[PDB]
């Protein structure tokens, strides 16, 4: 029960790209608890976007997103060269159980 | 409307349960009673919990439901939610409504806990404000939420019209029978309910809604 | 609260391996714990979660009945007892700390460990 | 009409109390009168418990009449509470049956006939075994006797005959 995401997303410095993960109405379309994390190779993923449209302290405001229906999308504006990382999304599957997306690679 | 963390619970006792005054609603689904027969199917007492929650949390106020506010703010009669965009979405941003985010234990159904302390582990505030804005969407738009509790408060008694000079089947406040109703010249004392003949047969009655004495004559035979 | 995960080692399939991650300070008992695994060449997979009081335990269906997550309230340490590990059950295991304290389950992971690699 | 209920017997013996405060028995009913000038006797208290062990207190003020049924200065339980216009606001005749039925008829202890018209029946559902007036008050008692009530053309009782008074009646 892992939400499918594109294998890779193109991008360039000074521009904006959108990374989205899609599931079903059971989890994505039922609860508004979409969370996104940024993972660097050889290191644990770091949380950047939580609760669909909220970000934790210390995370740059460029990392945002929106959700509609059963599709959750993360929008990054003004991406830099160092922001290229493997992004994965999370959603509440219910019964105190969470699931994570396949993982979308962000390019620069 | 009070915050979801500390809702305003109003009990109903010795009430005429006329629900036709209340019934555009965002959602209206009650369990354990007929939605169209709330007057007939009554209970002993009713408690109404009033709170303000976001549109995205409207589905969380239900029996057996889960969520950030379902398990920590309000746990679940009737679940009534209505739009309050023009009433609660202040232009400068309304932060009067506050919702609990973390709790030591899961909240019991129909149980509310009001606290303003800061949890120390490094400081975390369990209660967070809901920033409703006029530019927010349907999910982020404010909505007035009323939660009813089902547990002596019944609907008003039904009444029909008055027909005179025709053989009717009347029922005057429990005094039943058949006869022809007409205006009577009898002058009841202001504490009497009906009249009797020399043979202990009903000859008149006072209308409970008009305070007029109506002669009763049997239908012809 | 930095998390240091150890115990990763190579074992034959069908063996039982325990993954333990140690927290920094005494704040482990003040927040929940979660387990996440990362298979090579794939994304992150959620393994389970533990309540702040250590009573409420939840895990995914794919890890139901085989992986057990335990925490020590006095030593601020947690354990992940994986039983009947298969050949395909080779992944990097890391521990995640809940963003909000007590029992919330409505927030992301604030602190993540280094990660322990398990191979079979 | 020939009725059989609790009535005060004709030419009975009604006690006369002038006070310048005993607790009287209740039996099956009580006929009460008070021809006092000014306002002195303006209340009643009913209850076998007459303590915290319920009792009914009826207090009449100039503005209104306050009826309360608690376990009394102790406002405990209070399963019933009702207010209405004043009873005692001449001669102030009263009858207290027991649903605590109260009758009354105000008139200028002479000889004559005047009927009592009900005021209020309240379902206290409590035991009433004694009462005491709280301030020229008489206290009769009702007994299960048969009367021959006469109704005029307008529905008002104009006369009555006690069937167990003398052979002629
Ligand atoms: C009953 O209510 C109607 C209006 O609903 C009014 O006209 C009428 O006077 C009322 N009667 C009494 C006895 O209160
Ligand atoms: C009332 O009491 C007096 C004094 O004892 C007695 O003589 C009289 O017969 C009584 N009247 C009755 C019982 O009607
Ligand atoms: C009130 O009275 C009822 C009976 O009428 C009794 O059962 C109940 O215990 C009483 N309650 C109190 C608080 O005295
Ligand atoms: C009244 O007294 C009787 C005994 O005389 C007792 O059994 C009964 O419970 C009492 N009723 C009430 C309503 O207190
Ligand atoms: C009944 O009252 C009417 C006025 O309503 C009056 O004319 C008539 O005389 C009264 N009847 C009696 C017997 O007093």
Author numbering:
A (entry chain I): 2 to 109
B (entry chain C): 347 to 369, 373 to 425, 431 to 475, 487 to 516, 523 to 592
C (entry chain D): 2 to 121
D (entry chain A): 50 to 69, 81 to 113, 115 to 133, 161 to 177, 188 to 196, 200 to 209, 216 to 242, 264 to 297
Can you provide the manuscript's text about this entry?
Here, we describe a highly potent SARS-CoV-2 RBM-targeting mAb, designated VIR-7229, which has unprecedented activity across the entire family of sarbecoviruses. VIR-7229 recognizes an epitope in the RBD antigenic site Ia,28 which overlaps with the ACE2-binding site (i.e. the RBM), burying an average of 950 Å2 at the interface between the epitope and the paratope. VIR-7229 interacts with the RBD via polar interactions and shape complementarity mediated by all six CDR loops, with the heavy chain CDR3 (H3) dominating the paratope. VIR-7229 tolerates extraordinary epitope variability, partly attributed to its high binding affinity, receptor molecular mimicry, and interactions with RBM backbone atoms.
Out of the 11 mutated residues in the BA.2.86 RBD relative to XBB.1.5, only R403K is found in the VIR-7229 epitope, a substitution which would preserve electrostatic interactions with the VIR-7229 light chain N33 and D52 amide and carboxylate side chains, respectively, as observed in our cryoEM structure for N33 (D52 is not resolved in the map). As observed for other RBM-targeting mAbs,28,47 VIR-7229 efficiently triggered S1 shedding, a mechanism that can contribute to viral neutralization.
